[PDB]
Nucleic acid binder design. Sequence first.
RNA 1: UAGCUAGUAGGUGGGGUAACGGCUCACCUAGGCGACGAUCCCUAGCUGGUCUGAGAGGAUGACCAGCCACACUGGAACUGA
RNA 2: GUAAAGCGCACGCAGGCGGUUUGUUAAGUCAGAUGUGAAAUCCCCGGGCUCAACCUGGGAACUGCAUCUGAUACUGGCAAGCUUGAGUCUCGUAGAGGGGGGUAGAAUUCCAGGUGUAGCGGUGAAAUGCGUAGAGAUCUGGAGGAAUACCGGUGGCGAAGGCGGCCCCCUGGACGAAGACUGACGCUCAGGUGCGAAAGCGUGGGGAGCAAACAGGAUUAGAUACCCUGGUAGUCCACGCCGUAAACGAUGUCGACUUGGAGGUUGUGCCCUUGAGGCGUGGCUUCCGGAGCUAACGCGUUAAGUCGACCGCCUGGGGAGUAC
RNA 3: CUUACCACUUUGUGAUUCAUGACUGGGGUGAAGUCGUAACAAGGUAACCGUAGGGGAACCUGCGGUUGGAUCA
Lengths: 129, 88, 6
Amino acid sequence: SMQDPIADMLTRIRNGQAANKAAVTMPSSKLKVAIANVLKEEGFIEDFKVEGDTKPELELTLKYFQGKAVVESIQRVSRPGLRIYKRKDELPKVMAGLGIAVVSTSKGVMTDRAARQAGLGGEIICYVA
Amino acid sequence: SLSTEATAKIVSEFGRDANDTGSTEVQVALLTAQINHLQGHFAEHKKDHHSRRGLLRMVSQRRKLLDYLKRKDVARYTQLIERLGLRR
Amino acid sequence: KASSXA
RNA sequence: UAGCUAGUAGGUGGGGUAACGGCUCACCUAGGCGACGAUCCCUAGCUGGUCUGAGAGGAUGACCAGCCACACUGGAACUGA
RNA sequence: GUAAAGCGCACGCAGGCGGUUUGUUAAGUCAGAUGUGAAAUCCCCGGGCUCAACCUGGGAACUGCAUCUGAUACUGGCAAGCUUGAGUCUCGUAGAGGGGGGUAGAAUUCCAGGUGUAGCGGUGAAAUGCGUAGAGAUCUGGAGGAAUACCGGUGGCGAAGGCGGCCCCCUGGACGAAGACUGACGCUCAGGUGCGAAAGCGUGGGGAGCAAACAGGAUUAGAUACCCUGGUAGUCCACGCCGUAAACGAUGUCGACUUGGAGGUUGUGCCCUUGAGGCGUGGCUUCCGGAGCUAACGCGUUAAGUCGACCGCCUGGGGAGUAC
RNA sequence: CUUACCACUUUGUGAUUCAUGACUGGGGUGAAGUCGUAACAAGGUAACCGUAGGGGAACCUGCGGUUGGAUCA
Ligand SMILES: [Mg+2]
Ligand SMILES: [Mg+2]
Ligand SMILES: [Mg+2]
Ligand SMILES: [Mg+2]
Ligand SMILES: [Mg+2]
Ligand SMILES: [Mg+2]
Ligand SMILES: [Mg+2]
Ligand SMILES: [Mg+2]
Ligand SMILES: [Mg+2]
Ligand SMILES: [Mg+2]
Ligand SMILES: [Mg+2]
Ligand SMILES: [Mg+2]
Ligand SMILES: [Mg+2]
Ligand SMILES: [Mg+2]
Ligand SMILES: [Mg+2]
């Protein structure tokens, strides 16, 4: 059954990005937005949009550059089937730096750079580049 | 299968109104009905396994509702089992 | 198994 | 190897030891353990560490040091801090 | 998928995992602080033996455990919900889905009766066999078992195995359409339970056709076979046992997502239903093919693409799915 | 002197494990052995799977399944 949206979001992005799709919809959530935010804020998509009342609908605008898309690779790290909690020294560095790692902290859902500067740790959600 | 009255009747017996057709209690009953009826159906036959496959689903499904109820409304469950005279 | 022996 | 368990599990009260304790004894409750592997078999002294490995791992417990056990074999107390 | 590897298939307990909103919690998670983590070792920088090995000063390290105090996004717990997941109801829709019970229509075989006259049958050729005590050919009615031509599909239903004449009785599931209702009740499943071709096993029936075994005739160097003439168990029914098949898509289940094109099938909605029909919208199902995947052949919105959850299984050939 | 505990040790009957055993079962390995030629081509009767019966031997036959069957049948 449908036991992991967070993942599902990521892959809807990846599957869309692949097919040169201009937009991407999905039944929404707070955390999807929390994520979707880091994507604009860190420069991977142009912006989100929530046409919703009882059954929200988060909508993303895919970025592209040349004939190739902006989300080079997007990977679900932690899963319900296997949870991943890092500290701060153990925070990952995607692409030797040139890439972000969405991590959920007790002061909010930020990037590895952010979590680093803020000097805190938490469940790493996913790698992106 | 299940008589339109017999269905309607029971919906208007265990259900908190007619039209409250999706109620847990109702289903449990609507099921217990069928299960009990078919009971005579496979009283002879015994070989209508395909149907029995259907029976078992009803029985299964019921056990999963009775269980839901026990988790939610301890009172309604306990009252319900004595009400259908089953579960033991 | 087995001509000239062998 | 899927069951194990009578001082067995707990309580009370005596006794007991440097000391807590079924450590022991009488009585009373009927418990206690187990698929998060009891029970039963097989092998083994443990660690610091050593060797290998990019690491994660695998392999290992000589020499040094810490800890435990044993002193022909089985058993037992005495002396005494 | 074909290299070793998806359990034949479903139901389901324990376990794992879990949509969406708020509050709270603070177990997991995160942050900081204090004890601690023997020395030697390793590592860094030095120092001492002519150098090195060796010896040595100080540090770093010991990725750990514990505690107190904090942080509250995610996870978990508790409280109250929400309706898209899931589920009940309403009307229908299609269907070899199942069990039980009648009957119809060809055909084979057998019996009875008629004429008839010497052939039928079979093969590569022959023969055994059936007719000279009269078959086959052939004439009529009747008995019995088994299976349902044509429709018939590239179809349909079922979890799988599987299920085709017609008719009646009880019964499963699916799907479309409008809504109504419960409100995360869900996904998966070690063990467990059940179903599970054909052959086989027990008791009793039934037995036309076909046919292991067996017999006879041929073939061949041989022929324990292929072929021919016969034919018993069996195939059919009742009940019980058996649990295996190349039980195959050699492809586990569930959910989401990713260009197209030609059909089949069963629905529903709209068009003076105008009449061959058209244009939407579902479920299911053949064919070709993009990307992507792939060792390749090929798979390709019914994935073998892109992701997640849970289970099953594989680890060189043989020995062996054997021995204990 | 006596009582309780208790070691060596005694008896009966099981479990288990190691070695060994006339004889026997298949297995593996050995340039050219004997018998036949089952499979690979439509392998000269398409093959294979489960099962059953038979046969010096591979195998042969019945029932159902599979295409991992060649062919304008
Ligand atoms: Mg006391
Ligand atoms: Mg005392
Ligand atoms: Mg390794
Ligand atoms: Mg001694
Ligand atoms: Mg294979
Ligand atoms: Mg399968
Ligand atoms: Mg909470
Ligand atoms: Mg140290
Ligand atoms: Mg029989
Ligand atoms: Mg098998
Ligand atoms: Mg094709
Ligand atoms: Mg065996
Ligand atoms: Mg041959
Ligand atoms: Mg052949
Ligand atoms: Mg056959």
